[PDB]
Amino acid sequence: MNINDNLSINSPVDNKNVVVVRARKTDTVFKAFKVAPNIWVAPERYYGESLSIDEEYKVDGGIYDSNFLSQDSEKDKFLQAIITLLKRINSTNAGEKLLSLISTAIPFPYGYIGGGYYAPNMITFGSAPKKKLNSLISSTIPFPYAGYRETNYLSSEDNKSFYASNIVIFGPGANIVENNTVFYKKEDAENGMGTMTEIWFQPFLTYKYDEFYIDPAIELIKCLIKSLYFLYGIKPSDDLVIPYRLRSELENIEYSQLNIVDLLVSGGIDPKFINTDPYWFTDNYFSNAKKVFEDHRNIYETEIEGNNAIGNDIKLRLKQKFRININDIWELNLNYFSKEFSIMMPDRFNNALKHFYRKQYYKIDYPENYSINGFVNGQINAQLSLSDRNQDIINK
Amino acid sequence: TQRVLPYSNGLYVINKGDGYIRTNDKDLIGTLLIEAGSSGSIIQPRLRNTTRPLFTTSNDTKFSQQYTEERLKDAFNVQLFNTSTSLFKFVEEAPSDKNICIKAYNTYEKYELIDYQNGSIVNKAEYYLPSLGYCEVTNAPSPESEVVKMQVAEDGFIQNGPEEEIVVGVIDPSENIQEINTAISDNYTYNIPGIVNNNPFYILFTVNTTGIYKINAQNNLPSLKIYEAIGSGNRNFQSGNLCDDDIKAINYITGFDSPNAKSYLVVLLNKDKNYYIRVPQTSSNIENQIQFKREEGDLRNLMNSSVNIIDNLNSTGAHYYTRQSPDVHDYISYEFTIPGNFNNKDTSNIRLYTSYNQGIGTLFRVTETDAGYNLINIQQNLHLLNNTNSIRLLNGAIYILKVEVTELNNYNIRLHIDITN
Amino acid sequence: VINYSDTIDLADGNYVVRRGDGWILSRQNQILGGSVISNGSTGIVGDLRVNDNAIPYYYPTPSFNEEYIKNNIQTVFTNFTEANQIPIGFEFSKTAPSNKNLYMYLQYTYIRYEIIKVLQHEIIERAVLYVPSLGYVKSIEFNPGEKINKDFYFLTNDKCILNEQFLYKKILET
Amino acid sequence: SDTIDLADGNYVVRRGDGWILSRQNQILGGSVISNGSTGIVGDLRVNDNAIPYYYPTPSFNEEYIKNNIQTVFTNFTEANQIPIGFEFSKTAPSNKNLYMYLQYTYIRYEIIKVLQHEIIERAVLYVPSLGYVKSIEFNPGEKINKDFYFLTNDKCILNEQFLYKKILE
Ligand SMILES: [Mg+2]
Ligand SMILES: [Mg+2]
Ligand SMILES: [Mg+2]
Ligand SMILES: [Mg+2]
Ligand SMILES: [Mg+2]
Ligand SMILES: [Mg+2]
Ligand SMILES: [Mg+2]
C-alpha cells in the first residue's frame, strides 16, 4: 500500500488517523499519526528519557539539546521528513515488502481471559412469541467473538479508546544523533509472542563517511529490520554477543563486542565472518527461537485458524506473519537494501565508527536536500551545510 | 407558507425522529425471502460494536463534527457516537398460504443543530446517530413480474419512524458562564464583573425561596433572558448551595433579544431548580448590576413574562411597537404611561390591538393605595387581533397590558397604541 | 408549583440508602436508538455485554466523595465494582399489528443509591449514585404523520418506572 | 438485453437483492427434520463468506468495479467486517419428513458500456448479502422435481432492479 500523505501537525484529532495516546502506563501523553496500517509516527522527542542529563552521563560523540523538537514547526518538519523517508522506502519493491511485513507482523495476542485459544462460549438471543411457545427457537452467537487480547495497541488519554499499533516512530531521546529501537515489553519480546516496537530517529542530521553522506532512509531501514526481532518475539538473551573488534589501542587485552541482532541487521563485511555456510558459531538461542516460533505457528494452525469467532483483521495478518521463516529474518540485513536502493553505506566495522574517525554532522532539509529519489545530486554531490551543532559534540 | 418558529436567539438541538435510511438501498442490511410456513430472523448481534454515524453541515469551521457531537452531549447527554452494544433482531413468520419478503435496513436518528437568529436559521448541521434498524415486510413478488428501469435518486434520507420533533436549547460555548454558588435571597444585587468585557454571558444561580421574582438591570437596560436547567436538582444536593450538574440543556422561559429594549422579567423560580440568565452584548463600557427581588405584591400577576417599558408615548396619534413574539400560551407585557398631565379627571381614548397574532389581553392600572404598589384589574379577555373596541384611560397614568399569545401567525408581535383626544 | 421536601424522620447522622431498581434518567431516553417494525413483524431489542462494566454516574457532595460513596455502597449493598465484570443481558420482544407500524426504543435502567446527611429531622446534604441495572423499552403504534405525545420521547426529570424504595443504614465509622 | 435508452458512456447499475447463482444451490448443505420437530438453519456473514465475487471485462477491471460501486452504492468493504446473522425455521408435520436447503443471496452490480444506445460491454459483481432456503415434504422413494434442487442460470428470487448512474470521466 501507500503511506498516508494528508497529515499535518495541526491536523484535527479524528480518532482514526490522528490520536492522542498515553505513553505506556505513565501520566505522560503524546500525539501520534497513522501513516500505514498499524504504523504510527509521533513527531516529538521520546518520552522515556530525560532531555537534560548529567555531564558525567553524556556519551562521547553525542549532541544534547532539551529544546529540540519542542516547537510545532519542528514537529511538522519531523513528521513530513518521516513521511518522505517512508515514501522513499515504500517506492521500491523490497522496501514496500518490508513495510508490508511490518504492518502484518502483529505481536501474538493473548487468548481468552480464562486462558485458552480454542473456542468461545456461545449464547442464545431472540424468540418467536407463540399454540407453539417458540422459546428455544432463537439465534445462537459465539459469546466473546474477539476474546483474544492484543498486546499491540495505544490507549487514549481517557483509557476508553484503543488503536492498533506495531511501530511508533518517535524523535530522538536525550542524544539527538542516536537512533534507537526499543521494545514495549521485554517478556513478550523474548517469548515468541512479540511486542510493539518504538523507534527513535533523527532525520535532520547525517555524517560524511569517506566522501559520501549517510542516507537517512537506510538508517530508518536498519531500525525497521531490528523491529522484526521484537515483532516476532525472537529477541535473543542479552548475553548473546559476538566479538567485534580487538581493542589494540589499550595496553591490556580487551575485546569490544556486539549484540547478535546489531551484527545481523547492520550488515557490511563483518557479519559474513559469523554467518557461514557451515555454521561455526551456534547458541541455544537459534534452536530455542525456532522452537518457540514453531510453537506459535502451531497455535495458529490448530486453534486460531479453525475459529470463525475471529475477525479477519487478526487471523489473516497472523497467516501472512507465519508465511515467513525465522531464517528469513536472520538472513535479512542492510546489504540487501544497499543493493536494492543503490545506497552507499560503511562496510567495515559500521557499528564502531566512533573510534576510527570523528563524525561531523550535516543538516538535511526536506524536500530541497532530500526527495523521494534520495539525496538531490546523489550521496556524493549533495549540497549539504554543516550543522550548527558540531560545536556541541561531547568529547570524551 | 412558512411555519413560524417562536424560538429565541441561540443554539438548539432538535431530535427530528428515528428510523432514517438512505436512498438507493445504501443502508440495506438485506432481504429474506421466507417460504410459506417458515420463519426468518435477521440479527445485529454487535459482535463488533463499531457503527458509522453520518454528518452534514452548512459550515464546517463553526458547526464541525466535534462541535456538533459536543452540542449533542449537551442536549441529550449522548456519549457513544462510534460504538454501540445495543442489539436488534427482526423475526417474521410467513403465513401458511403465501411467502413473505422482509427487508432490513440500518437506521439513523436525525439530530439537527441550528443557530436560530431573528426568526431564521443562519447555520444548520445534521448528525445522523446510528439507530436500531428498520424492517419492512411485503408480499412475495409474483415471479417474475416485470422490471422497470430507473435512474438512481439524489443523495438523501427517508424517515420510516414516527413523527418527532424534540427541541432542546443548549448553552453557547463561546459565552462565559458565571455561577452564584450560594442560593438567592429574596433581594440580591449581582455586580457584573469586568472580566466579561461587555460580552454576552450567562449567570447560573439557584433560588432560596420558591416564588415570583422581578429580575432586571440598571434602568431596565439591557433586556435579559432566563432559562431553566432541564432536569436540574434531581441529584446531588447541599442545603443553600448551588449543586451544579453540568447541565447545559436549557428551557427558554422569557426574555427579549433586543439589547436596546427596556424590559424587566417577572418569572416564577423554584428553590430546587437551577436557572441561567443571559445578558446580551452591550455596546458600552457600562457597569451593570442584575437586580433580583422576590415579589410579594400584585406584580405576581405578570408571571411569566417580560414587561416592555414604552418611553416615546409622549404624543397623541398612532404608535406601534414590534417585539419578538412569544410562543402559543406564553406571555408578553407592556408598561406604558398615557401622555398628558395626571389630575384623575383628564382622560384620552386609547385603542389597543395587534396586527397579525391573536392574543388574550388583561389590562391592569397602576395606582398607589394604602398598601403601595398595586395593580387593579380593569380589562379582561380583550381580543387584540384587529380589536375594534376602545377605552378611555386617565392621562398621566401608568398601565400594564399582559398579552397571552393564542395564535402564532408571525415571528414578531406588533402591539399598537392609538390615542385620540 | 410542586415541591420536594427534604425532611426525613431519621436520627442525626449519615445514611446509605438504596432507592430501588428501575430508574431512568432525563434526556437520555432515545440516545440508544430505536427499531421500526411493520405489519406483523416481531422486533426484538436487547443488550448483552461481555464488556466488563457500564460506567456508573456519580453525583457527589463536599462531605461524600466517590471513595466514600463507593466504599459504603459496596460495603452495605451490591459489590458493583467487581460484579460489573460478570456478563449481563436482556431482551424485549414486540409484535407489530397488521397493516400498522410500531416503533420501540430502549433506555438503560439504574439503581439509585443515596448518601444523606440528616440533621434535626431534615436532610441537609445528599449525594447520588446511578449504577446501571438493565434496560426498558417504550413503544407506540403510529400512522404516517400522526402526532405523538412529547412525553413518550422526552423525559424532563429523573423518575422511577417502578415503586421507589428507601432502604437505609446509618453509616458508622468503624 | 440490448439497445437501452441511455446516452453513450459507462454506467454503474444496481440490479437489486436476492440473486442466487447457478449450480450453487445445495453446496451449503441441507437438513432433514421429521415428525413435529423444528429445524433452524442460518449463517453469519463474516470474513471469507462475505468476500464478493468479481467478473470483469477488458475495460472494467476489479478496481474500477469496486471503486465505482462503492462510490455510488453501499460500501461493502466496511460493512462486511461487521458480522450479520440470518436464520430460517421450518416445522415438520406429524408423521412426515421435510427437507430444507440453504443458499446465499447476492447483490448484483453491473458496470455497463453504452455505445449508440446499445450495451456493448458488461461486467458483474456479486456481493454476498444474506441467504435463502427452500423446503419440501417428501415420502420414502418419492421423485422430486429437478427445479427444486438445481438452477441453470443466475436468477433473482425477488423483483429485479435497474438503478443506473453515469460514471463521470
Ligand atoms: Mg434530506
Ligand atoms: Mg432569604
Ligand atoms: Mg408563598
Ligand atoms: Mg430595538
Ligand atoms: Mg416593522
Ligand atoms: Mg428492587
Ligand atoms: Mg456506506
From TrEMBL, chain C:
Protein name: HA-70
Signal peptide: none
Top-level taxon: Bacteria
